[PDB]
Symmetry: D2
Subunit: 386 residues, 4 copies
């Protein structure tokens, strides 16, 4: 029943199944996992590959000797299992030096350090074959209004990303960047808080074609926003380079539940969109197995991520293939939404008396949209009840 | 005490002080106001000008004769008082024909009608001297996932705004457009839900220089977002063409309280930013006097809008002029935030061993940011308690 | 497929399918429905009965003659269809006189009027056979802090409900009261904002056994609360006299979507609880068919309310009957949660060295709770994918 | 300027100024503080006393020898400074054994352990002179619906608190309990999520007079609720035994900002209420100095807590003493809210034709409430601008 293959392109971060369960009010409930064991266990479950922060793979403060040993053992597990590494990223948030940010820290020497730590890990990412480099600026922000002049901060943020674009262009690397937005936590407010703010920032970079977004289900839902809508806007702009899948129950702390938990109907509309638009990138899970769980529960939670995606894929495909649904879509005029408003042009529209002077407003107004029957067909399909 | 003059450029919509108090659960508690009387009373209070939707000024379905009579009486009140009309907009949300939207309605004939109704009011706006034309797409959106393909909807939205840009370019009008975002209400989710999503959409229009944003305090706060931060991003992009001021107590229905109500410290940081950046446009209030109030209370609420802005302006100016505050800003390194990270360039940064190999991370980490003393000086100034 | 019968005890308010679609930003999109036609159409769909506010049935300001005529025609439709009237309530929110409340209005003459309007409709409710009388104090509250001394307001609220209890005791009526909480809208904050605040208030009334709660799915979700949890607390206290079913997508304006829309997994856990606890009252829908819809869509939306309840009932019953689920419940120690902590008593617990001095904390800590496998079995059952 | 004395009864938890800055995404930024030094530094700032969790004072797993040494050194610092210990509480949330709760853990042996750990610390609290014992059940709850049967959990919660009441009655201790509600974090949903749910639960305990609430500003605001309103309901019920003061910016993770930060007008209305009702208990701060700060900033943040309370006390007292404000309160009929609705009794009200048959609804409806002028006087007073 609903078994994943490496062809489904499911990926997990080392830090996901590796989360030891330390939260703001409690100590860890699980021992540390060796990244080599996580690679093996994930390959057994049907995953396609893994992702990493620099500091997940190479402990902070490691000598070039220990660094080389850690990478070599990782490489061997990849060769042994067939697992890929499609994305990597930088930890610019755990160590105390980043307490006021990395790229937008008020201290200039910290910003320079942040850039050098990033560039070193871009080299490693290319070596391991990654196509996408993600940046989540979790410490870029403020708890108080006077601590951060946001215009100056956006200048420094642009400067950082422009320098990174110069670096990969100089080296001839085939890698693209993806900015991951989040509205708050751990800072009181985070810069570039939603998909839209990130898309707008990208258009001010020197080489905008090198940058896209890495949206996360739970993050947009922490602002009360419709995640499938934001993903549609990112696809419309040609900027969905990567995506993070998980679950969230509303406006509260970042829960990082397994995918399919949280807002189930939103998860259905998301899969419908991703499959219908032909998104071809990794289906990456950024989730945390609850700290109530032991290691058997960690792997059950990971498996459930993939299972829920495949069940929703099946139901969304049945929905769109149903002749009764295609009829209802025409009844609600989704076909007319796809047709241009005025391909005749501005002058024709102005001269068209049926568009205003002779337009029957009351006849158009009384036409029902038939959206509630359409949505109940969608419910019936989701629940396997047609 | 804190008396406004027309030099402060305070403006109000006719629909604000004119709101009769009808809400989803109750009938109106006040009689209709003649726009001529609203103009006189606002001029007496020290306002600079007024704004309007087409349907606030000319009742829907009016003959060209009645239209001319309504405009002439309005013009006369403006000439009598010295009041200006800096902005106008279109009602694409009240009449039943717009129940699924105007520019993104699924029905093509409704979209054409929406465009013609808008163009007619652009002509009137130019005649009355408006510099800015606002578009709030309050019905553009959905309550259910299958009712609206958002990529097709964004195509239709771009098509509409592009045609409007062709129209004003054709006519030689000196007017710019400002898109007003809102996350929800009256639709379950509204397209372009925040300042960031609107800024990103503008960069895909054919003539992006003609378009900017008209953010509203309460709207960004309905998504839990930091309004001064979003305004800083809009200023950084050169896109703050207009602004709507009001108050909101958190994530809930759109309250439209008078300015200064709701989140008072956010209102302080907003005024600080607007004055420090030299924003030169109208300070426009989109608010609703609570339906508990009679007409004496309507004018008290309007007066309070302007009063609160002027008190906050005074306190923000005292904050920034205080030598002890300028010292604390240097203590928190706001001066270093304004200096480039790497004006030496990429190669210099890579060769700079003090940026990584010889960087003392523990010494930098132990440096306090001193942000809590800075924020208490800001509190003391806001409260008049230094 | 999943057809309701009057035995399922589904009920609808006249004001639900009767909503004409007027919202704060738009005029009505549907004509008024005659309550006689709503009764017939609902009986055809399989409903059990209907509910009403006084002003839904008898237009405000009606003579005793017109009142009698309106009731007689309603009675006849009930006799013709077999439909029952299990609950009634009072409109203390639409007319302008209630703009600062009914029972807690600052004006004493309005409070007296509110009580007399209520008592007149209690008599009618008894005549029509209602068992439950609901009070939703939608105008009891404030937009500003100084307008309402909440201690005095709670005194007036208690006084009102105590007088109502004296009235029904005097008359010998077999009717109970149910208070309906809501956190906000249309007032900025509403008194008794959640199920918990209402339960606590009831314990200070003179005759607490006459009063219970009428919680609404969407209302508790406007505070971000877990609705099944609140319903469990109300059942634990013996106070769930009635319930309002609908859907809501998070913290925002009151959406009143059809039941099953909004938070689908919460709807599943709610049905599981109601059926497992043997709740025997009406399954009442307080919803609004979206104003995008014509009358065919109104009835499709009503039908979908009942359909979704019956599908979820079936899946929750399959979940609890599954031997693999009963095994997993024992694996997560739900059986031990049901056993007393210390039926041996306080002295035995203090003398029990295995409870502290010889308790192995690290062995207990390492035991996994197995909650993620249990929740995936619940997901599989909900989606019909075992 | 605004200097606190021990007469102001300001108290702080050891865990507040002692927070090392570890958050879910970052390591600690400050070294551990010796509780002896925290006592001295707080006494220097003008605090009245301190509070503690068992595990803040005596490291978990300490021998009776080390326990005695830790208490003796604490006692000496108290004797040296004059500081009091008015409240204590139990850590039932940090150690992994409490990962599914303490009093409502599914495992029975963990629940017994939780009760024994609590009882041992009640004895210590009495020895140190505490009058109030707080219980915050931060782990009592769930992330998934099937993990916790809430009726059984409330049975176990009642059983635990009843046993604790039997214990203190047996020992003859003069101490009362205060339950602290929180809606979520660190569990996905927490049992007894608001002040109202806690007040309702207390009325089902065997000896309800021994129990009250300990509400926290930020916690009620994480549900979007009006904190002064909830505090008024707790005062009305006679159950405000203790209070936790801090700041929060809306619906998001628990920020624990210093008091006066976050919602400033809510802080003003809270102080107005506490002073006007004659609340006589400790003004306790449960806050976290941001991890951006060094130790100088920790003490600046603590000082600011007390400063902001004293400034707001002064402004609220000026507001209520202002003759123009007392006039406006009569204009909005706050005097009539305080007078009984029907001291004449039920029969008199029914016979009073001026209450219904001859009541002029339109005359009452047109009366303005004058609430916007009242609220602007409150704003003017808060800002020191009359
Ligand atoms: Mg996350
Ligand atoms: Mg992520
Ligand atoms: Mg608004
Ligand atoms: Mg606006
Ligand atoms: Mg509702
Ligand atoms: Mg209801
Ligand atoms: Mg807290
Ligand atoms: Mg606390």
């Amino acid at each position: 029943n609903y078994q994943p293959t490496p062809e489904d392109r499911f990926t997990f971060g080392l830090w996901t199944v590796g989360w030891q369960g330390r939260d703001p009010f409690g100590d860890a409930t699980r021992r540390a996992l060796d990244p080599v064991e996580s690679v093996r266990r994930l390959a057994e479950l049907g995953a396609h590959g893994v992702t990493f922060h620099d500091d997940d793979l190479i402990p902070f403060g490691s000598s070039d000797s220990e660094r080389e040993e850690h990478v070599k053992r990782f490489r061997q597990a990849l060769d042994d299992t067939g697992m890929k590494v499609p994305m990597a990223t930088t930890n610019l948030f755990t160590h105390p030096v980043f307490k006021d940010g990395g790229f937008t820290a008020n201290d200039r020497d910290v910003r320079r350090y942040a850039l050098r730590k990033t560039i070193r890990n871009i080299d490693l990412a290319v070596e391991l074959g990654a196509e996408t480099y993600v940046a989540w600026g979790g410490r870029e922000g403020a708890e108080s209004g006077g601590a951060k002049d946001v215009r100056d901060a956006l200048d420094r943020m642009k400067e950082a990303f422009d320098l990174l674009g110069e670096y990969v262009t100089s080296q001839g690397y085939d890698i693209r960047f993806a900015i991951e937005p989040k509205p708050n936590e751990p800072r009181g407010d985070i810069l570039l808080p939603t998909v839209g703010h990130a898309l707008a920032f990208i258009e001010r970079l020197e080489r905008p074609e090198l940058y896209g977004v890495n949206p996360e289900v739970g993050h947009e839902q922490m602002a009360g926003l419709n995640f499938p809508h934001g993903i549609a806007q990112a696809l419309w702009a040609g900027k969905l380079f990567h995506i993070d899948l998980n679950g969230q129950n509303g406006i509260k702390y970042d829960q990082d539940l397994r995918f399919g938990a949280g807002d189930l109907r939103a998860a259905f509309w998301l899969v419908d969109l991703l499959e219908s638009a032909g998104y071809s990138g990794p289906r990456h899970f950024d989730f945390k197995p609850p700290r109530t769980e032991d290691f058997d529960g960690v792997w059950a939670s990971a498996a459930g991520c993939m299972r829920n995606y495949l069940i929703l894929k099946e139901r969304a495909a049945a929905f769109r293939a149903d002749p009764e649904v295609q009829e209802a879509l025409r009844a609600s005029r989704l076909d007319e939404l796809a047709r241009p408003t005025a391909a005749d042009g501005l002058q024709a529209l102005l001269d068209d008396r049926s568009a205003f002077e002779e337009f029957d407003v009351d006849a158009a107004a009384a036409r029902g949209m038939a959206f509630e029957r359409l949505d109940q067909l969608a419910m019936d399909h989701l629940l396997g009840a047609r």
